[PDB]
Structures are given as structure tokens and as C-alpha cells.
Amino acid sequence: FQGMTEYKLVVVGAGGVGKSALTIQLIQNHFVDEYDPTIEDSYRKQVVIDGETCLLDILDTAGHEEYSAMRDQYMRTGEGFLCVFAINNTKSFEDIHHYREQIKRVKDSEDVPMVLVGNKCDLPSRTVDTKQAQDLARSYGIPFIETSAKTRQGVDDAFYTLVREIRKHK
Ligand SMILES: Nc1nc2c(ncn2[C@@H]2O[C@H](COP(=O)(O)OP(=O)(O)NP(=O)(O)O)[C@@H](O)[C@H]2O)c(=O)[nH]1
Numbered sequence: 647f648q649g650m651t652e653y654k655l656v657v658v659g660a661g662g663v664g665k666s667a668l669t670i671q672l673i674q675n676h677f678v679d680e681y682d683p684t685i686e687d688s689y690r691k692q693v694v695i696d697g698e699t700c701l702l703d704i705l706d707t708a709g710h711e712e713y714s715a716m717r718d719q720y721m722r723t724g725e726g727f728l729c730v731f732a733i734n735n736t737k738s739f740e741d742i743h744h745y746r747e748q749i750k751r752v753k754d755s756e757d758v759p760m761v762l763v764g765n766k767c768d769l770p771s772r773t774v775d776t777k778q779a780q781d782l783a784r785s786y787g788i789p790f791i792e793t794s795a796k797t798r799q800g801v802d803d804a805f806y807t808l809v810r811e812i813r814k815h816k
Pocket residue numbers: 659660661662663664665666667668678679680681682683684685707708709710765766767768769793794795796797
């Protein structure tokens with residue numbers, strides 16, 4: 647034993663869905679109200695999940711990004727993916743399929759650890775129904791979690807569930 651197990655997590659999804667808010671809420675217990683678009687940021691947190699101490703290495707991605715070769719590099723290194731949309735933005739939900747395809751393509755695999763995340767569940771302007779999202783997740787064979795970076799609902803659960811998925815995969 648040389649140190650706690652390490653997991654490489656990538657947070658992906660359309661611009662504005664709250665990928666950064668979720669990550670910052672996890673790491674710093676802080677909600678960011680301001681919208682500062684991200685290019686690429688890396689974070690690290692030690693947690694205990696199901697009695698195993700482990701180290702989450704988290705890559706926060708950009709939503710607004712085209713073809714890049716830098717992009718495909720970290721999808722190759724990443725062991726698990728949080729695919730985030732916002733429950734008040736139907737476009738970000740439809741984009742989920744595109745994110746999953748990019749991942750499946752680069753990892754050259756049908757069975758990649760993933761979790762579907764419906765963020766901003768605190769907002770009253772919901773446009774994507776929970777049942778719809780559960781059905782999408784059921785069809786992909788992956789878990790679905792509703793989160794709010796603001797209230798903190800589901801945040802820990804989302805990351806911990808992803809880790810549990812990576813564990814099952816090996
Ligand atoms: N009400 C509410 N607002 C949220 C939530 N998550 C993020 N936001 C808000 O939505 C905006 C976008 O959040 P942000 O984390 O920057 O989104 P992002 O996916 O990281 N954007 P980008 O892809 O450009 O980096 C911020 O103003 C933030 O306050 C949430 O769960 N609830």
C-alpha cells in the first residue's frame with residue numbers, strides 16, 4: 647500500500663449548467679452566484695466512500711468548446727464522467743447524447759462509468775421532467791441524480807455515486 651486509491655473524474659455538459667458550481671460546492675462548501683465561464687480547472691478532494699479512503703481528482707471542463715485535441719486527451723485519461731444538464735434548459739438535456747457519444751468514441755467502449763446529473767433542481771422554471779431524465783439514464787444503463795449547487799442537494803451523492811460506478815467497472 648503506497649497511498650489512498652485515486653479516481654479521475656471529469657465533469658462535462660453544456661455551458662451554464664453549473665459544472666463549476668457543483669465542483670466548488672463539493673470542494674469549498676461555497677455557492678458561486680457569478681457566472682465565470684471555464685476553460686479548464688483541476689481540483690482534488692479526499693473523501694471516505696463505503697469505508698475506502700480515496701482521492702478524487704476532478705477535471706472541470708468548458709461547455710462552450712469545439713473540436714480540440716486537448717479536449718480528447720483528458721477524456722482518454724478520465725475514468726468516470728458526470729454528464730450535467732440543467733433541469734430548466736432543454737437544450738442542455740438534448741446535448742447529453744452528444745457528450746455521451748464523444749466519450750464512447752474516444753474510450754472506444756460502450757460501457758464507461760457515467761452518471762447523469764440534473765442540476766438547478768431548486769429552480770421553479772423546470773422544463774425537463776424527472777421521469778424523462780430517468781428514462782434516458784435507464785436507456786444508457788447509468789444512474790441519474792438531481793442536484794442543486796445552491797441548496798447542496800445531491801452534490802456529494804453525485805460524485806460518490808460516480809466513484810461507486812468506477813469501482814463496479816473494475
Ligand atoms: N439556482 C441555481 N443556479 C445555479 C446552480 N448551479 C449553477 N447555478 C448558476 O448558474 C450559473 C452558471 O454556473 P456555472 O458553474 O458557471 O456553470 P458552468 O457549467 O461551469 N459554465 P461553463 O461551462 O461556461 O464553465 C451561475 O451564475 C450559477 O450561480 C444551481 O444548482 N441552482
